[PDB]
Design a protein around this ligand. Structure first.
Ligand SMILES: [Ca+2]
Ligand SMILES: [Ca+2]
Ligand SMILES: [Ca+2]
Lengths: 105, 156, 67
C-alpha cells in the first residue's frame, strides 16, 4: 500500500464529515425554498365590506377543495413510488479484550 | 472492515503495545512455535466464562491468521485485540448523493476528487490513487452504491 | 345541470352564505390557514418525489449491474 491505512481512515472520516454538512445545508436551502413558495402559493391574508368580503370565503372554500386535490394526486405518486422501491429493493436483495487483559496480567 | 483494524493498530500507543506484549507472553507459556493456537486459546476462554468448541476455537484464529499457520502470533494478536475495543446503511445513502453531483448513480474519479479537496486537508497524488482502487473492487471507474457501503464500514 | 356540480358548488352556500360577519372575519382566516397548511404538505410531497426518482434511478442501476 502506498499510504498508511491509518491515514486512509483519516481521509475517509473527513469525507463523511462534509457530506453530512453538505446535507445539513442542502436541507437548509430547502427550508427557505419552502417559505419562499408559501408567500407565492399562500399569499397571506389582509382585510372588508360585509358584502364582497363574502365572495372571498367562497373562493378560499373552493380553493381548499382543489388544493387537497392537488395534494392527493401527488401523494398517490409518492405512495406508488414507495411501493416500487420496496419492490425493486426486494429484487436486488436476493443477489473480549478488556475482560481478558484483566484476567491475565 | 479490514484496513480499519490496522488503523487502530498503528495508532496503538507504545504504552499499550507493552501490556499486550506482556499479556501475550503469558498467553503462550507452553506452546512450541511461541504463538497462540487452539490449546492456549482454549485456556483463557473456558478459564474465562465460556467453553468454545475446538473448531469454534479455530475460527477465532482464521479471522486474523494472515500467515495460514493457525498460530496467532503477536502482530496477529494486536489485530485480535482491536477487534474488541459504526455508521448505518440508512445514513450512508443520503451521503451517497452528496458525492454523486451529476446524479447518475455512481461516483467517478472526478466526483471523489472534488470531495477530497473540500476536506481542508492536503491531498497528494497517491492519496486519490489508493482510495479509488480501495473502493472500485472491479476497476470499472466508479464506486456504485453496493461498494460505497463496503467502502465506508465503521467510519465514524 | 349536472347532479354533482349543483351539489359541489353548494358546500359554499351551506358553510359561508348563512350568518355573521364578525364570524366571517374569524372564519375567512382559518380557511386560509387550512390552505397554508395544505400548500406546505404539497411542497414536502414534491421534494420527496424528486428524491424517489433518484432512489429508483440508483436501484435500477443495481438490479442491472448485479445480474
Ligand atoms: Ca499466523
Ligand atoms: Ca456520478
Ligand atoms: Ca465499481
Amino acid at each position: 500500500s502506498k499510504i498508511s491505512a491509518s491515514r486512509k481512515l483519516q481521509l475517509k472520516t473527513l469525507l463523511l464529515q462534509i457530506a453530512k454538512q453538505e446535507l445539513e445545508r442542502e436541507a437548509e436551502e430547502r427550508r427557505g425554498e419552502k417559505g419562499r413558495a408559501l408567500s407565492t402559493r399562500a399569499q397571506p391574508l389582509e382585510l372588508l365590506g360585509f358584502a364582497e368580503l363574502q365572495d372571498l370565503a367562497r373562493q378560499l372554500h373552493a380553493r381548499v377543495d382543489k388544493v387537497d386535490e392537488e395534494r392527493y394526486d401527488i401523494e398517490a405518486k409518492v405512495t406508488k413510488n414507495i411501493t416500487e422501491i420496496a419492490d425493486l429493493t426486494q429484487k436486488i436483495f436476493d443477489l473480549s479484550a478488556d475482560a481478558m487483559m484483566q484476567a491475565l496480567l | 472492515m479490514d484496513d480499519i483494524y490496522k488503523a487502530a493498530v498503528e495508532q496503538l500507543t507504545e504504552e499499550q503495545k507493552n501490556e499486550f506484549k506482556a499479556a501475550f507472553d503469558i498467553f503462550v507459556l507452553g506452546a512450541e512455535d511461541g504463538s497462540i493456537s487452539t490449546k492456549e486459546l482454549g485456556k483463557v476462554m473456558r478459564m474465562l466464562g465460556q467453553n468454545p468448541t475446538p473448531e469454534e476455537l479455530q475460527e477465532m484464529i482464521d479471522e486474523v491468521d494472515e500467515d495460514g499457520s493457525g498460530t496467532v502470533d503477536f502482530d496477529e494478536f494486536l489485530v485480535m485485540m482491536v477487534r474488541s475495543m459504526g455508521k448505518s446503511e440508512e445514513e450512508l445513502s443520503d451521503l451517497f448523493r452528496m458525492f454523486d453531483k451529476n446524479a447518475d448513480g455512481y461516483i467517478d474519479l472526478e466526483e471523489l476528487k472534488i470531495m477530497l479537496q473540500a476536506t481542508g486537508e492536503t491531498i497528494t497524488e497517491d492519496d486519490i490513487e489508493e482510495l479509488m482502487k480501495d473502493g472500485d473492487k472491479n476497476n470499472d471507474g466508479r464506486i456504485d452504491y453496493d461498494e460505497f457501503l463496503e467502502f465506508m464500514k465503521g467510519v465514524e | 345541470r349536472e347532479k354533482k356540480k349543483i351539489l359541489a358548488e353548494r358546500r359554499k352556500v351551506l358553510a359561508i352564505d348563512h350568518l355573521n360577519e364578525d364570524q366571517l372575519r374569524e372564519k375567512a382566516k382559518e380557511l386560509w390557514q387550512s390552505i397554508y397548511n395544505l400548500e406546505a404538505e404539497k411542497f414536502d410531497l414534491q421534494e420527496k418525489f424528486k428524491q424517489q426518482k433518484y432512489e429508483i434511478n440508483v436501484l435500477r442501476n443495481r438490479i442491472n449491474d448485479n445480474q
